[PDB]
Structures are given as structure tokens and as C-alpha cells.
């Protein structure tokens, strides 16, 4: 069978932390010289939609995480260094103000 139930759709869709693959150029815009491998990374972020027009999915709690990443300077060597990324811990719908 291939039909999802309304309550199961609602629960899974509602504003919550979810695994999201985000590019590094977005998180670190001031790195035009450097190329990063891999370019994207898996982070817990606040995806989903809210009940009402007046509410928006936002992070109540946050936490950082470290990852082993490579940075490549064009024709000037590279280095498997380390980088920290922001990942949202708990999300909740809040007024837009």
C-alpha cells in the first residue's frame, strides 16, 4: 500500500529539526579564494511549516558541531583542516512580529 495518513503527514511536516545538506559558500561567504571538498555538509536545521499565517518555524535552542573538511587554495596546496558549523537543536513556531 502507498498512501500516507493525514496525522502522519501532519506530524512529519510540522516545524522540527531535520537533516539538511548545506553548501559551505553560504555559511562562509568571505572565502572566495578557497574551494572546499566536500562543498556541502549535513546539519540539523529547522525545516517544516507552521499552523498559521502569523507563525514561522524558528530555532529556540542551538548548538555547534565540528567536522573534518578540506580547504583547497587554487594551485597553492590544500589541507584537511577542521571547521565548526551551526546546527539547530530544537525548533518551534513563533509569531513573525
Amino acid at each position: 500500500h502507498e498512501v500516507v495518513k493525514f496525522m502522519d503527514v501532519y506530524q512529519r511536516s510540522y516545524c522540527h529539526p531535520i537533516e539538511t545538506l548545506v553548501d559551505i559558500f553560504q555559511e562562509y561567504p568571505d572565502e572566495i579564494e578557497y574551494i572546499f571538498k566536500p562543498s556541502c555538509v549535513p546539519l540539523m536545521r529547522c525545516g517544516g511549516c507552521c499552523n498559521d499565517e502569523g507563525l514561522e518555524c524558528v530555532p529556540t535552542e542551538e548548538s555547534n558541531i565540528t567536522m573534518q573538511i578540506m580547504r583547497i587554495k587554487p594551485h597553492q596546496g590544500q589541507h584537511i583542516g577542521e571547521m565548526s558549523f551551526l546546527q539547530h537543536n530544537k525548533c518551534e513556531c513563533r509569531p513573525k512580529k
Partner: nanobody, 116 residues
Framework: EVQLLVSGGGLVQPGGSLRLSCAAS????????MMWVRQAPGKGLEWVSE????????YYADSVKGRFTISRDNSKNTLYLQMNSLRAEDTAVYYC?????????WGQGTLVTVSS
């Protein structure tokens, strides 16, 4: 900080009546919409009703519509569900929550049974 405490359940006759009350605290009750859900023994979750933040828009399930009435007192920070003309099918545990994901807070659940 959140708390949702429910009361007013128990046993009842067929074609009877009950009124549930969900005491809210720890968040801006007035800003959010609220909802009731229920779980029958040996079955999954089922959505019953929603009410908008102002209380101007009410929503009901295909089963309960006409019999059930949802309402709220934004000043007293409470959600009400007036259940009427109850049948054998309505026997379930009734949960009140702003977030449909997070359930099972001490207060949320209340067992409603329709007698024979």
C-alpha cells in the same frame, strides 16, 4: 516551561455528553492555534479538531463534525472540547497540544469510555 493539563473525562452513556478542559501555561497561548487528537485502543492516532488563535475559525474531522464543539478562553488560557451524542467509536484517550509532534505530557491524556 510548557504545561498542558486536561480533565473532565471518564465513563458515559450512548448519546450522552462530556466537556474536556485543557489548562495551558508556559507559552503565549493566545498566539497559537490549538487542537485535539485521540487514540483508540489497538489503533493509530486520529485528528479530531482545530481552533484558530483568535477563535474565529474552527475545524473538525469528517467523523465528529456536527456533534463536537471546540472553543477557547484566551484570557483564562484554556481549550475546551464539548463532546455530544457519543457512540461506541468515540472511545479513546484524548490529547490536547499546540505542537502535534510532542505528546504525552502528564496532563495531556484523559481516557474517555462509552459504556454499554
Amino acid at each position: 516551561e510548557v504545561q498542558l493539563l486536561v480533565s473532565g473525562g471518564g465513563l458515559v452513556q450512548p448519546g450522552g455528553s462530556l466537556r474536556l478542559s485543557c489548562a495551558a501555561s508556559g507559552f503565549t497561548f493566545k498566539a497559537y492555534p490549538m487542537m485535539w487528537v485521540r487514540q483508540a485502543p489497538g489503533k493509530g492516532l486520529e485528528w479530531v479538531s482545530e481552533i484558530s488563535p483568535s477563535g474565529s475559525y474552527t475545524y473538525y474531522a469528517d467523523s465528529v463534525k456536527g456533534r463536537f464543539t471546540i472553543s477557547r478562553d484566551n484570557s483564562k488560557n484554556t481549550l475546551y472540547l464539548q463532546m455530544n451524542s457519543l457512540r461506541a467509536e468515540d472511545t479513546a484517550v484524548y490529547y490536547c497540544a499546540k505542537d502535534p509532534r510532542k505528546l504525552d505530557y502528564w496532563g495531556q491524556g484523559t481516557l474517555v469510555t462509552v459504556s454499554s
